[PDB]
Motif scaffolding. Structure first.
Motif, PDB file in Angstrom:
ATOM      1  N   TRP A 168       1.578   6.434  -4.886  1.00  0.00           N
ATOM      2  CA  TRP A 168       0.444   6.630  -5.783  1.00  0.00           C
ATOM      3  C   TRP A 168       0.374   8.061  -6.289  1.00  0.00           C
ATOM      4  O   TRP A 168       0.164   8.293  -7.483  1.00  0.00           O
ATOM      5  CB  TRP A 168      -0.859   6.263  -5.075  1.00  0.00           C
ATOM      6  CG  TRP A 168      -0.827   4.932  -4.430  1.00  0.00           C
ATOM      7  CD1 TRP A 168      -0.596   4.666  -3.119  1.00  0.00           C
ATOM      8  CD2 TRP A 168      -1.031   3.669  -5.066  1.00  0.00           C
ATOM      9  NE1 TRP A 168      -0.641   3.315  -2.895  1.00  0.00           N
ATOM     10  CE2 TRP A 168      -0.907   2.681  -4.079  1.00  0.00           C
ATOM     11  CE3 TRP A 168      -1.305   3.279  -6.378  1.00  0.00           C
ATOM     12  CZ2 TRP A 168      -1.047   1.329  -4.359  1.00  0.00           C
ATOM     13  CZ3 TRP A 168      -1.443   1.941  -6.653  1.00  0.00           C
ATOM     14  CH2 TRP A 168      -1.316   0.980  -5.650  1.00  0.00           C
ATOM     15  N   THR A 202       0.816  -1.206   0.000  1.00  0.00           N
ATOM     16  CA  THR A 202       0.000   0.000   0.000  1.00  0.00           C
ATOM     17  C   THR A 202       0.851   1.257   0.000  1.00  0.00           C
ATOM     18  O   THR A 202       0.375   2.318  -0.407  1.00  0.00           O
ATOM     19  CB  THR A 202      -0.938   0.012   1.199  1.00  0.00           C
ATOM     20  OG1 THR A 202      -0.177  -0.090   2.406  1.00  0.00           O
ATOM     21  CG2 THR A 202      -1.906  -1.140   1.115  1.00  0.00           C
ATOM     22  N   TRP A 203       2.103   1.170   0.442  1.00  0.00           N
ATOM     23  CA  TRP A 203       2.961   2.344   0.484  1.00  0.00           C
ATOM     24  C   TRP A 203       3.717   2.555  -0.816  1.00  0.00           C
ATOM     25  O   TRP A 203       4.788   3.169  -0.811  1.00  0.00           O
ATOM     26  CB  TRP A 203       3.925   2.275   1.669  1.00  0.00           C
ATOM     27  CG  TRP A 203       4.821   1.095   1.709  1.00  0.00           C
ATOM     28  CD1 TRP A 203       5.947   0.895   0.972  1.00  0.00           C
ATOM     29  CD2 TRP A 203       4.689  -0.044   2.559  1.00  0.00           C
ATOM     30  NE1 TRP A 203       6.518  -0.307   1.299  1.00  0.00           N
ATOM     31  CE2 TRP A 203       5.763  -0.903   2.274  1.00  0.00           C
ATOM     32  CE3 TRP A 203       3.761  -0.426   3.527  1.00  0.00           C
ATOM     33  CZ2 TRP A 203       5.934  -2.117   2.921  1.00  0.00           C
ATOM     34  CZ3 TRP A 203       3.934  -1.627   4.167  1.00  0.00           C
ATOM     35  CH2 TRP A 203       5.010  -2.460   3.864  1.00  0.00           C
ATOM     36  N   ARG A 204       3.185   2.053  -1.922  1.00  0.00           N
ATOM     37  CA  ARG A 204       3.591   2.532  -3.230  1.00  0.00           C
ATOM     38  C   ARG A 204       3.302   4.024  -3.330  1.00  0.00           C
ATOM     39  O   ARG A 204       2.416   4.552  -2.657  1.00  0.00           O
ATOM     40  CB  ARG A 204       2.842   1.770  -4.320  1.00  0.00           C
ATOM     41  CG  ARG A 204       3.467   1.834  -5.685  1.00  0.00           C
ATOM     42  CD  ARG A 204       2.414   1.658  -6.757  1.00  0.00           C
ATOM     43  NE  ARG A 204       1.813   0.333  -6.705  1.00  0.00           N
ATOM     44  CZ  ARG A 204       2.113  -0.654  -7.535  1.00  0.00           C
ATOM     45  NH1 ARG A 204       2.998  -0.497  -8.501  1.00  0.00           N
ATOM     46  NH2 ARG A 204       1.515  -1.830  -7.387  1.00  0.00           N
ATOM     47  N   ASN A 249     -17.608  -1.906 -11.318  1.00  0.00           N
ATOM     48  CA  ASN A 249     -18.462  -0.724 -11.268  1.00  0.00           C
ATOM     49  C   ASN A 249     -18.100   0.290 -12.341  1.00  0.00           C
ATOM     50  O   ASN A 249     -18.204   1.498 -12.118  1.00  0.00           O
ATOM     51  CB  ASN A 249     -18.398  -0.077  -9.886  1.00  0.00           C
ATOM     52  CG  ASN A 249     -18.856  -1.006  -8.792  1.00  0.00           C
ATOM     53  OD1 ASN A 249     -20.012  -1.414  -8.754  1.00  0.00           O
ATOM     54  ND2 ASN A 249     -17.949  -1.350  -7.892  1.00  0.00           N
ATOM     55  N   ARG A 270     -19.255  -0.271 -15.849  1.00  0.00           N
ATOM     56  CA  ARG A 270     -19.877  -0.966 -16.971  1.00  0.00           C
ATOM     57  C   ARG A 270     -20.009  -0.065 -18.192  1.00  0.00           C
ATOM     58  O   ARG A 270     -19.592  -0.433 -19.294  1.00  0.00           O
ATOM     59  CB  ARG A 270     -21.245  -1.501 -16.556  1.00  0.00           C
ATOM     60  CG  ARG A 270     -21.184  -2.719 -15.670  1.00  0.00           C
ATOM     61  CD  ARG A 270     -22.508  -3.451 -15.636  1.00  0.00           C
ATOM     62  NE  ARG A 270     -22.691  -4.313 -16.795  1.00  0.00           N
ATOM     63  CZ  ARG A 270     -22.221  -5.548 -16.885  1.00  0.00           C
ATOM     64  NH1 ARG A 270     -21.511  -6.089 -15.911  1.00  0.00           N
ATOM     65  NH2 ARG A 270     -22.470  -6.257 -17.981  1.00  0.00           N
ATOM     66  N   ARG A 279     -27.101  18.899 -14.838  1.00  0.00           N
ATOM     67  CA  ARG A 279     -26.408  17.675 -14.352  1.00  0.00           C
ATOM     68  C   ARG A 279     -26.917  16.386 -14.989  1.00  0.00           C
ATOM     69  O   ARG A 279     -26.111  15.453 -15.116  1.00  0.00           O
ATOM     70  CB  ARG A 279     -26.430  17.614 -12.824  1.00  0.00           C
ATOM     71  CG  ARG A 279     -27.790  17.438 -12.177  1.00  0.00           C
ATOM     72  CD  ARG A 279     -27.547  17.530 -10.685  1.00  0.00           C
ATOM     73  NE  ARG A 279     -28.710  17.152  -9.908  1.00  0.00           N
ATOM     74  CZ  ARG A 279     -28.777  17.204  -8.590  1.00  0.00           C
ATOM     75  NH1 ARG A 279     -27.737  17.628  -7.896  1.00  0.00           N
ATOM     76  NH2 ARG A 279     -29.880  16.836  -7.969  1.00  0.00           N
TER      77      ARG A 279
END
Ligand SMILES: [K+]
Ligand SMILES: [K+]
Ligand SMILES: [K+]
Ligand SMILES: [K+]
Ligand SMILES: [K+]
Ligand SMILES: [K+]
Ligand SMILES: [K+]
Ligand SMILES: [Mg+2]
Ligand SMILES: [Mg+2]
Ligand SMILES: [Mg+2]
Ligand SMILES: [Mg+2]
Ligand SMILES: [Mg+2]
Ligand SMILES: [Mg+2]
Ligand SMILES: [Mg+2]
Ligand SMILES: [Mg+2]
Ligand SMILES: [Mg+2]
Ligand SMILES: [Mg+2]
Ligand SMILES: [Mg+2]
Ligand SMILES: [Mg+2]
Ligand SMILES: [Mg+2]
Ligand SMILES: [Mg+2]
Ligand SMILES: [Mg+2]
Ligand SMILES: [Mg+2]
Ligand SMILES: [Mg+2]
Ligand SMILES: [Mg+2]
Ligand SMILES: [Mg+2]
Ligand SMILES: [Mg+2]
Ligand SMILES: [Mg+2]
Ligand SMILES: [Mg+2]
Ligand SMILES: [Mg+2]
Ligand SMILES: [Mg+2]
Ligand SMILES: [Mg+2]
Ligand SMILES: [Mg+2]
Ligand SMILES: [Mg+2]
Ligand SMILES: [Mg+2]
Ligand SMILES: [Mg+2]
Ligand SMILES: [Mg+2]
Ligand SMILES: [Mg+2]
Ligand SMILES: [Mg+2]
Ligand SMILES: [Mg+2]
Ligand SMILES: [Mg+2]
Ligand SMILES: [Mg+2]
Ligand SMILES: [Mg+2]
Ligand SMILES: [Mg+2]
Ligand SMILES: [Mg+2]
Ligand SMILES: [Mg+2]
Ligand SMILES: [Mg+2]
Ligand SMILES: [Mg+2]
Ligand SMILES: [Mg+2]
Ligand SMILES: [Mg+2]
Ligand SMILES: [Mg+2]
Ligand SMILES: [Mg+2]
Ligand SMILES: [Mg+2]
Ligand SMILES: [Mg+2]
Ligand SMILES: [Mg+2]
Ligand SMILES: [Mg+2]
Ligand SMILES: [Mg+2]
Ligand SMILES: [Mg+2]
Ligand SMILES: [Mg+2]
Ligand SMILES: [Mg+2]
Ligand SMILES: [Mg+2]
Ligand SMILES: [Mg+2]
Ligand SMILES: [Mg+2]
Ligand SMILES: [Mg+2]
Ligand SMILES: [Mg+2]
Ligand SMILES: [Mg+2]
Ligand SMILES: [Mg+2]
Ligand SMILES: [Mg+2]
Ligand SMILES: [Mg+2]
Ligand SMILES: [Mg+2]
Ligand SMILES: [Mg+2]
Ligand SMILES: [Mg+2]
Ligand SMILES: [Mg+2]
Ligand SMILES: [Mg+2]
Ligand SMILES: [Mg+2]
Ligand SMILES: [Mg+2]
Ligand SMILES: [Mg+2]
Ligand SMILES: [Mg+2]
Ligand SMILES: [Mg+2]
Ligand SMILES: [Mg+2]
Ligand SMILES: [Mg+2]
Ligand SMILES: [Mg+2]
Ligand SMILES: [Mg+2]
Ligand SMILES: [Mg+2]
Ligand SMILES: [Mg+2]
Ligand SMILES: [Mg+2]
Ligand SMILES: [Mg+2]
Ligand SMILES: [Mg+2]
Ligand SMILES: [Mg+2]
Ligand SMILES: [Mg+2]
Ligand SMILES: [Mg+2]
Lengths: 206, 134, 263
Positions: C58, C54-56, C145, C147, C169
Motif C-alpha cells: 500500500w 492485506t500484504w499488498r 462515509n 457523502r 476550522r
RNA sequence: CGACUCUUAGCGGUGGAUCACUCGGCUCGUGCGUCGAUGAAGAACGCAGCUAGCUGCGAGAAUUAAUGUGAAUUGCAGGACACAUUGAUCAUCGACACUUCGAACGCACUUGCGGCCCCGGGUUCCUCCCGGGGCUACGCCUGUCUGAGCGUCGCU
RNA sequence: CGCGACCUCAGAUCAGACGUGGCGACCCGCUGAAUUUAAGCAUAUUAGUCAGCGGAGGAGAAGAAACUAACCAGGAUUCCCUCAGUAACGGCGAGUGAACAGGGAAGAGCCCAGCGCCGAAUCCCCGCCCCGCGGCGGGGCGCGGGACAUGUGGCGUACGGAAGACCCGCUCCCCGGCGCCGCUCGUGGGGGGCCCAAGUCCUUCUGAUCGAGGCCCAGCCCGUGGACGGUGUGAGGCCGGUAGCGGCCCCCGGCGCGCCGGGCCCGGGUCUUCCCGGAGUCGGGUUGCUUGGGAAUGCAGCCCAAAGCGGGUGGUAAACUCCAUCUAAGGCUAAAUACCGGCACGAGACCGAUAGUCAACAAGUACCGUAAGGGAAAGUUGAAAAGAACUUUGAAGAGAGAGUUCAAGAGGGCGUGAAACCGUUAAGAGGUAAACGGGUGGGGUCCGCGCAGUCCGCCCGGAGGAUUCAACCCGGCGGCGGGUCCGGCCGUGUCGGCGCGGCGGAUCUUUCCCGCGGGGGACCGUCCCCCGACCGGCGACCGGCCGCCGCCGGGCGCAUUU
RNA sequence: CCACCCGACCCGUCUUGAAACACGGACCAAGGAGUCUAACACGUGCGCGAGUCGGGGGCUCGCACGAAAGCCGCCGUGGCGCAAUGAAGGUGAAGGCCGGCGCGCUCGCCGGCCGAGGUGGGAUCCCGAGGCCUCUCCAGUCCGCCGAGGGCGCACCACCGGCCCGUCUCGCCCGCCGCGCCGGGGAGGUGGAGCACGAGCGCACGUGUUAGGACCCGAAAGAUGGUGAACUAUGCCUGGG
RNA sequence: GGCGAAAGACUAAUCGAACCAUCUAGUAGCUGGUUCCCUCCGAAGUUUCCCUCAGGAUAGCUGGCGCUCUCGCAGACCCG
RNA sequence: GCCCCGCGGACGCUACGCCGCGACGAGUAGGAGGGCCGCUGCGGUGAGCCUUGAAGCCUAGGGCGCGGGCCCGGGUGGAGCCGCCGCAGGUGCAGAUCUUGGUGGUAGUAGCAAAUAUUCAAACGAGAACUUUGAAGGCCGAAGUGGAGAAGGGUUCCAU
C-alpha cells in the motif's frame, strides 16, 4: 526454466509462508503506544531522568569496533569501589551496576570512576522526609535546579584528540612501515618453530 | 467537525442506533421546538413531546395555525397523533395520521413535577453556556 | 477478502462420464446447494481469482530531497497569480500574491473574526465558491462515509497557534498549515500546483530559515539548500527576439511550395 | 380468400436483469483481556391473555427487587388501586431467584432402584405407608478418630 | 500372655480445603505425515509443518552466563533493523541456513540447599477475649493439640560470606484505618446519568419539501458547534446530536499531606582469623531423532561412570603445553513481544443481495445422511395503509364500476422492470430452410417542416430622425521614452570599517582559568547587517516629474459633418 | 419492411490440412480466467551524486482528515557503491620526458618538470590561403556566406604499451630490534567477473524470468483423524416356523 | 481392517481397499477456455544438448528501444 | 525626406501546434504504439447537471466517429449523476460437456394399459363416471382384499 542471461535465484518460498506473514499496519499504533508509555513513566518518576540510570563508557569489542565507545550495561564493582559508592546504594540514586563486568585495563576503570564522581556532583538528592534533611541536597538546590533531565544521562561521546602539524624527523622518514608489518607477521608465524629448533639444538649441543 | 474518537460518524451505525433505540432514548429523539412565547418564557428551545401537549403542525399537508392536542406518542413508529390531524378511510372510519414530532411546535406544555424539573435544567444550562460565551 | 471465502465447503469433482463439467461440486443432497459448482472463480459462491491480500504494498517511499523539492515548487507556484487562478481560486480582488497578514491573526478566537478578515482581504469569494461546490458525491462513496464533496479553499499558513486553528476550522474549504510542517498533500491538492495560500508575517519570515536561499543554507534543516534552475531565463520570447540570436539566424523560408500538376 | 410461418413496431404477459437504495459483511486499528463442583460450555423441556418461529426467561419463567428515567406498551384487548406520577415505560443491574441432563456427583441412566438423619400426617404408642427437607461421586492435601503388621524396640 | 513407643500401612458420608470440564487466536510440552519439489526416485524437500495428545495466562515461555569473544574487549531474557540468503548444510543436486559484533525498544534484579552460628529462636490447627472488622486479620492468653532434630526459622549464596578487634556515621523502614481532600493521573483519573448556540422569517416550487430567490450598511443568524443521523427532496440554524481545560449529579480507584492500630529498626570501613557449593549428574561409548553445526548442534535410550589447583567452554578428530573465560547437574522475576477466540469501540481509495461471511431475512435455519458430517434459497408497496367503502356478475377463484394516492401505468414476493420466450394488434412478405455482404428500386415511419428560401461588408440614390462629427479646451487613466529626469533600488567589484554579528572549521593557542581536559581567545572560510568613496543597469521590483501618443468622462463645436 | 441481380457453407478450437461424417455450442441474462508478494535483469522517468538511502527508532502538549505530514545528523548503526585477486596465508592498481652519473642491464640510483601513455578512425570546435559583391577608380573600416588546406580532438571502436592479484620460468641485488627455513625488489610468459581521473544510490513505471494456488477449470492417486455390521458376511445368545 | 462352503464375494444403491472431514486451490511435459478498438512490424516447425521423441534448454527466425554516424541547399522570390 | 489625402492593412503559432513534399498499406503465432474507446472507486476541478425530473430501461426519432463507442429527441422512471486533469483496480465475454438463474422447440406429444367389473335409482350439492344411501351383478375366498399385534411411523386416530 532459465531464459537467456539471468541470476540463479533460490527464493525461500517452498514452505507455507503465507500462514506466517507479519504485516506492519500497527507500526504507527505501536509508536504511539511506546510514546505514551514513555511519557507516563517520565511523569511517574519525575524529577528523576526520563531515559533511566547513568550508564558507563565501554569499548566495543572485535577489531571492527574497538575504535568506538558506547554506553555499557552498568558500572563495575571495582569502579563503584574506587568511587566510594556502595553497590546496594548505587541503584537507588540512579547508577546502573553490572557485577559481571571486570576492568581489564586501568584506563577504562579511571574513565568510569571519573564519570561516577562527576555524576555525583550533578546529583540533587531530595530528603526522604521533606521537613527533615540529613545529607541531602540544599533546599535551594532542590527548589529550583531540580528538573527532569531528558535524553541519556551524560551521553557517551567518541572523543578525538587533535594532533597539530609537526616537522617530520629523519627517523620517521627512514621507518619502513611495510617491511615492519611483513617481518612482524613472519616473526609471529615462525616464533614456535624457531623456539623448537633453538631448543632442539640446546640438548644437541649439551 | 466532530473530534471525539469515541463518537462514530458511520452512516450505518448512526442509522442502526436510531432505528433500534430503546423507548427512553426515543423520547429524546422525539423532541419538538417550543413556540416563541414558550421559548421566551422558559428559555428552552426544545422539549421531548408528551401526550396532552398542544401543538401546531408546521410542515406537510396538515400545516396550519390550528392548535391540537397530542393524543398518542407511538415511539415504535417515531410518530405522534394529533386530535384533529385525521383522514377518512374508505369504509368511513376516521384514523389519525402520524406526524413526526420535529415537524410540530409545542404551543402549550403539560406541566407536572417532572416537566418543571426538566425545563429548569435546560434553562440553567443554556444560561451557564452564556457565562461561557461571554 | 476473507482468506476462508469460497473454501468453506467440502466440494469435490464428479469426474468425467456424468455429462457435466469437471468443476468441483458440493457434496450431499436434500438442498439446492448440493451438486452445485464450487471453489471456482467462475462459480457462484466460489473464491475470486487471486484473492486480494492485506500484504499488498500500500505505502510508498519518496526521497526526502524529492519531497522537499515538491514543497518548493508548490510554494513557488502559489505566488504566481496565473497558476492560482488556473486552480479556480477566485483571487481577482486579492491585493497581492503572496498574501501576508499581520501576526495578530494567530490570536483570533472567534469564527466571526476569521470570516471578517477573509472578507477584508477579499478572499471571501473563494469561501463562497466552496459553498457553491457543496454537493453529493456520485456513486458508492456515499455508502462509505463520503457523502458530501466540496472544493478546496484558501490555505492559511501560520507560525505559532494562539487560537487561529479554532477560529478558522469551521469555515468550509479552509486548510490550516503550520509553516514548520508543510504538507504537499495540502499545498498541492489533487497533485496540481497553485493553491491560494494566506500567510502570517511570522510564518512568511520563517521560510528563509526553513528552506534557505541559494546563498545560505536552511538553518532549520540539517543539510538543505534550494534546488538549482537548469534554465535561468525562462522567457523564451525575449531570448529568440534578442539581437544576439537574430543576427545568427538564416532568413526564414515562408513561400509554401504546393504540388505541381504535371501537364 | 384465409390459415400457417417469418420480419419489424405498439401494447399486454412471462421472467427478474439493470439502476438506485443498505440496521449486513470484509479488512485494518484500539482498549480490555473475565469461564467451572459457589455446578461452566453445551443440550433438553418448559414459561406470554391471544404466540408457532426468532428473541428473552426458569415453576418468581417474554420476568421479581433495586437504581436511573419520567408517561408509556401497542397487532388486538384488558385494567382509573392491574389504564399507575404513591412512578407507565425503557435502561442499568450491585439484590433475590435460577427446572432436567451435562466435568455431573448415592447407584443406574428406565424420570429405574436404594441407604442414613430430621419434620409433618396416617389417633403413630412400635413396624410400616405418604409428603417435605438435608446428606450419600472419584482423586488428593493438612489435620482427627478407629485400627493392622512372626516391621523395630521397651516394660512386666 | 499383656501393656506401651515408633515405623510402614489401611478405613471413614471423619474437620476443613483443593483437582476434574470448557474455550483454545496467541503460548508451553510431546507426537508427527503425505500430497509437493527434485521435470523419474529412494537421502533431501515439503517439515518438526498439517492432522493427533497434554497444560496455561492475560500474555505465555525465556531470563540474570558452566555467555560472547580473542578486542583497548563486552556483559540476564525478549523484540526490531542489520548481520544475510551470509558462515555452514546438501544424491555439494533440487534445495536449505543460523550466530557474534553494531544500532535500537525495554531495562531489574534476586532466593535457596550446602557450609556454619543462634536453648526450634520456626510453622499449622483449635479454644477464648479485646480492637480495627462482608474472614482480611493484629495482639493477648491456654501446665491446648500437632508438625518439626530423617532439620523449621533468623543470618548468608559465588557480586564472596561470617565472627572478633579498631575507626567512622546514625535513628530508619513498612502495612492498615485518620481526615482534608494536593493531584491533564495526561488532552484533562475512571464508570454511569441528565443538560447546554443559531431561521422552520418573506416570496415561490412540490404530493411533501431539506429546492430556488431574498433577508441595508463586509450583517438573516450561530459558529471552539458547517461530523453524522433522522425528519414526506437535497437541513450548520426542525430534532438528536457536534464543539467546548462546558455545567450538574452519583459511584469507584491511585497518589498528596494529616493521628494512629500498629509492627520493624543499626549501617559502613580497615585488619586478623574461619568458611565456601547442587552425582546414576558431568563426562565417555553406542543407537535413533534433530540441527547450518560440518570426525557428531541439541535431545533421548542403553552401557560405562567422574573430579576438586576441579569442571565446562574456546565451531576439525588426538596427545602435550600455555592462556582466556565462566562455575553445570536447585529456584523466582515486571517491561519491551504475540494474539484469525472473547468483551467493547473506531475506521476504510473494500463489497453492494449470483457481490460481501455459508448466513443483510424465524441461518448453521429449512432440508439430506444411520452417523461422522453436508447445508441452501430467500432484501425493496407507499410520504402516510390512505391496504381499494359501496354497487354489480359469478358457487368461488376472478371481473366490471367506484374510491385512496403525485402515482396502483405502486394492489400486499407490491421501487425500477432488460433479454430469452409468448399473446395480441398494425404493416410487409412467403414453392429452392433461414439468415448474411454489395448495389439499387418500391413502400412505410418519422425528421427538415422545406413548402418561395442567401445574408454580411462597402459605395451610390431617395426618404426620415438625433444624446452629432472633426478640431480645440478641462479633468482622469493608461502605454512608451528619459538612470549623463529625480528618489527608491538592484547586479557586481575594490578599500576602510560596523554589529564580541551569526555559523562552521581534522587552523593556532605554556594571553589566561580551573579540574591530568574542558573553557576563553586569535586565525580562516562563509553568511548577515551596516557604513563612506565607487560601480553596470532599471520588464528585478518601483514611485514622483517631464515628453509623446491613446482611451474615457465633461465642455465647446449645432450641421455639404457624424 | 419488401423485391431483385451478383456474391455468399458455422462459429470457436486443435491441426500440414475444418463447411466437415473432428470436438464444444438449444436460447437469454448475470458471474467468468496473467493476479498479488518477494527476488532478479534490462529499459525508461525523477532526485541527489562519489556518494546515496532512514525503510528500524525517536521528537513534534498523538488522534476529523492525520495510521498522514514534518524533523533528526554524535539517529547513517547498517545496506549498496567507491578495489580487485587467491583455495588460503595474504598481497593490492601511474607513468613519460630533462639532465648528473653508475652499470650493461637493456637497466639501477639522485634533482627537476609534467601528470592516466601511444596509434588509426572520430560528432563538434579552432585556424584558413583563395573566393562573392555593392554606379565606377584609389587604398581602408564594419562585415556574412563559400572555402582548399591545416590544427585541438568528446564519446565510442579497434590495436599496441603499462598497472594490481594468482601462477610459472629465470636471474641478481638490497633491508635490519628480529641475520632468519626472515623480509623486499627485477625480467619474460600466462590465469582473473581488476586498474588505467569514478557512477552509483534511492524512488517510480514497464517488460521478461522465477518461488509461491501463480492465468482459470480438471485426474487416477498419497497422508492424518474419525463414522459406520438398520444392507450384507460370519460366530454366539434367546425366540418363532 | 473385518468377514468369506472362496465369487476378489460382502462390509448401508459405494469394494482389486467403505464412508466423512482435513492435508488440498495436491501435481499434470496432457485436454478445454482465456473478455475492447484502430495503427505499424511480423515468424517458426531448423541446429546442438537433454531417460529427449506430445516437453525443454540452446542457436536461428521476431519485435521493441535506442545509439553512432553519413547525406542538405548559393537565396523572401526565382535563380545550378 | 520614410512614412502619410487616407493613421490602416484577413487567418495564424492548443510549438505535445500548424503547414508542405515524396513513397508506401496482406497477415496467424507474437511484439509495440495510440485510443476525446469503455467500467468502478479516490484526490482536484467544472460558482458542473438534477423533483421545472438523476441513474436505469425502451425506441420504424435525428446524427457523429474507420472503429471501440458517443451525443441528442421522444417514452418510461422517481433521486441522484456526469465532463476535464491526475490516481487506483476484483475493469470489457460467445464459447470453457463453464457457474447460477430464467426460457423455448420437442408438445397438447410420450403417456395416465400388471393383478376379471361394473350398472340402476335417489339424496346432498352451484356442480356427480368417481361422495353417500338403497338395489343389482362381481371379486378377495379363512396360506383373505378378513380380524388383531411387534418393529417403524408420531397424531396419521375421532368429530366438525
Ligand atoms: K422504575
Ligand atoms: K548418549
Ligand atoms: K409482438
Ligand atoms: K479442439
Ligand atoms: K460440432
Ligand atoms: K506467476
Ligand atoms: K406396531
Ligand atoms: Mg529507553
Ligand atoms: Mg459498513
Ligand atoms: Mg484457503
Ligand atoms: Mg447429452
Ligand atoms: Mg463469495
Ligand atoms: Mg453508478
Ligand atoms: Mg473530490
Ligand atoms: Mg415488454
Ligand atoms: Mg411477473
Ligand atoms: Mg421492577
Ligand atoms: Mg433397562
Ligand atoms: Mg468431611
Ligand atoms: Mg483443563
Ligand atoms: Mg481478535
Ligand atoms: Mg517428482
Ligand atoms: Mg513433474
Ligand atoms: Mg511420481
Ligand atoms: Mg522435520
Ligand atoms: Mg496441529
Ligand atoms: Mg483466564
Ligand atoms: Mg512479559
Ligand atoms: Mg549467578
Ligand atoms: Mg546478547
Ligand atoms: Mg548483502
Ligand atoms: Mg548434518
Ligand atoms: Mg529444515
Ligand atoms: Mg547483537
Ligand atoms: Mg538452614
Ligand atoms: Mg439544537
Ligand atoms: Mg437528511
Ligand atoms: Mg443535517
Ligand atoms: Mg441556510
Ligand atoms: Mg462534547
Ligand atoms: Mg578451565
Ligand atoms: Mg586449546
Ligand atoms: Mg524466590
Ligand atoms: Mg439486484
Ligand atoms: Mg450471499
Ligand atoms: Mg450463499
Ligand atoms: Mg410514478
Ligand atoms: Mg387512480
Ligand atoms: Mg408505469
Ligand atoms: Mg411505481
Ligand atoms: Mg413491479
Ligand atoms: Mg443486401
Ligand atoms: Mg518577474
Ligand atoms: Mg490429423
Ligand atoms: Mg473451423
Ligand atoms: Mg466427410
Ligand atoms: Mg478432444
Ligand atoms: Mg453438443
Ligand atoms: Mg457479463
Ligand atoms: Mg534506472
Ligand atoms: Mg539522507
Ligand atoms: Mg484515521
Ligand atoms: Mg512519520
Ligand atoms: Mg554509507
Ligand atoms: Mg559505518
Ligand atoms: Mg584518440
Ligand atoms: Mg628472499
Ligand atoms: Mg603477472
Ligand atoms: Mg531476463
Ligand atoms: Mg484439484
Ligand atoms: Mg506414492
Ligand atoms: Mg444385523
Ligand atoms: Mg457362505
Ligand atoms: Mg478372478
Ligand atoms: Mg457408510
Ligand atoms: Mg488452479
Ligand atoms: Mg510430453
Ligand atoms: Mg542423462
Ligand atoms: Mg516419437
Ligand atoms: Mg495435442
Ligand atoms: Mg497491415
Ligand atoms: Mg444533430
Ligand atoms: Mg474494486
Ligand atoms: Mg475479472
Ligand atoms: Mg454469456
Ligand atoms: Mg472466444
Ligand atoms: Mg396421446
Ligand atoms: Mg395409454
Ligand atoms: Mg381367483
Ligand atoms: Mg371367488
Ligand atoms: Mg388355497
Amino acid at each position: 526454466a532459465p531464459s537467456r542471461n539471468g541470476m540463479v535465484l533460490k527464493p525461500h518460498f517452498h514452505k507455507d509462508w503465507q500462514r506466517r506473514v507479519a504485516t506492519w499496519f500497527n507500526q504507527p499504533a505501536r509508536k504511539i503506544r511506546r510514546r505514551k508509555a514513555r511519557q507516563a513513566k517520565a511523569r511517574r518518576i519525575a524529577p528523576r531522568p526520563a531515559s533511566g540510570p547513568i550508564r558507563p563508557i565501554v569499548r566495543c569489542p572485535t577489531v571492527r569496533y574497538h575504535t568506538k565507545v558506547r554506553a555499557g550495561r552498568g558500572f563495575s564493582l571495582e569502579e563503584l569501589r574506587v568511587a566510594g559508592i556502595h553497590k546496594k546504594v548505587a541503584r537507588t540514586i540512579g547508577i546502573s551496576v553490572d557485577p559481571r563486568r571486570r576492568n581489564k585495563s586501568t584506563e577504562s576503570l579511571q574513565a568510569n570512576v571519573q564519570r561516577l564522581k562527576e555524576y555525583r556532583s550533578k546529583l540533587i538528592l531530595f530528603p526522604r522526609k521533606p521537613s527533615a534533611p540529613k545529607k541531602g541536597d540544599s533546599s535551594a538546590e532542590e527548589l529550583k535546579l531540580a528538573t527532569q533531565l531528558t535524553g541519556p544521562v551524560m551521553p557517551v561521546r567518541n572523543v578525538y584528540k587533535k594532533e597539530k602539524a609537526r616537522v617530520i624527523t629523519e627517523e620517521e622518514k627512514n621507518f619502513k612501515a611495510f617491511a615492519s608489518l611483513r617481518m612482524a607477521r613472519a616473526n609471529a608465524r615462525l616464533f614456535g618453530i624457531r623456539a623448537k629448533r633453538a631448543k632442539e639444538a640446546a640438548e644437541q649441543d649439551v | 467537525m466532530k473530534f471525539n474518537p469515541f463518537v462514530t460518524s458511520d452512516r450505518s451505525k448512526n442509522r442502526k442506533r436510531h432505528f433500534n433505540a430503546p423507548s427512553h432514548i426515543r423520547r429524546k429523539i422525539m423532541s419538538s421546538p417550543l413556540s416563541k412565547e414558550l421559548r421566551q418564557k422558559y428559555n428552552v428551545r426544545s422539549m421531548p413531546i408528551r401526550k396532552d401537549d398542544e401543538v401546531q403542525v408546521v410542515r406537510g399537508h396538515y400545516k396550519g395555525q390550528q392548535i391540537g392536542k397530542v393524543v398518542q406518542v407511538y415511539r415504535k413508529k417515531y410518530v405522534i397523533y394529533i386530535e384533529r390531524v385525521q383522514r377518512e378511510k374508505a369504509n368511513g372510519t376516521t384514523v389519525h395520521v402520524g406526524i413526526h414530532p420535529s415537524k410540530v411546535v409545542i404551543t402549550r406544555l403539560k406541566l407536572d413535577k417532572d416537566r418543571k424539573k426538566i425545563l429548569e435544567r435546560k434553562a440553567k444550562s443554556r444560561q451557564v453556556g452564556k457565562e461561557k460565551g461571554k | 477478502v476473507s482468506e476462508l471465502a469460497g473454501h468453506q465447503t467440502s466440494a469435490e469433482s464428479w469426474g468425467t462420464g456424468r455429462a457435466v463439467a469437471r468443476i468441483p461440486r458440493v457434496r450431499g443432497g436434500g438442498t439446492h446447494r448440493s451438486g452445485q459448482g464450487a471453489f471456482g472463480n467462475m462459480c457462484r459462491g466460489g473464491r475470486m481469482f487471486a484473492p486480494t491480500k492485506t500484504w499488498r504494498r500500500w505505502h510508498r517511499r519518496v526521497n526526502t530531497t524529492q519531497k522537499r523539492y515538491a514543497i518548493c515548487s508548490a510554494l513557488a507556484a502559489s505566488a504566481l497569480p496565473a497558476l492560482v487562478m488556473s486552480k479556480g481560486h477566485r483571487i481577482e480582488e486579492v491585493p497581492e500574491l503572496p498574501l501576508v497578514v499581520e501576526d495578530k491573526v494567530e490570536g483570533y478566537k472567534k469564527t466571526k473574526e476569521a470570516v471578517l478578515l477573509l472578507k477584508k482581504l477579499k478572499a471571501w469569494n473563494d469561501i463562497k465558491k466552496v459553498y457553491a461546490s457543496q454537493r453529493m458525491r456520485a456513486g458508492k462513496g456515499k455508502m462509505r462515509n463520503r457523502r458530501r464533496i466540496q472544493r478546496r479553499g484558501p490555505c492559511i499558513i501560520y507560525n505559532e497557534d494562539n487560537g487561529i486553528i479554532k477560529a478558522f476550522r469551521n469555515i468550509p474549504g479552509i486548510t490550516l498549515l503550520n509553516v514548520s510542517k508543510l504538507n504537499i498533500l495540502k499545498l498541492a491538492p489533487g497533485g496540481h500546483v497553485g493553491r491560494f495560500c494566506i500567510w502570517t508575517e511570522s510564518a512568511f519570515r520563517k521560510l528563509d530559515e526553513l528552506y534557505g536561499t541559494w546563498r545560505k543554507a536552511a538553518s532549520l534543516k540539517s543539510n538543505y539548500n534550494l534546488p538549482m534552475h537548469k534554465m535561468i531565463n525562462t522567457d523564451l520570447s525575449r531570448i529568440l527576439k534578442s539581437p544576439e540570436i537574430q543576427r545568427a539566424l538564416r532568413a526564414p523560408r515562408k513561400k509554401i511550395h504546393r504540388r505541381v500538376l504535371k501537364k
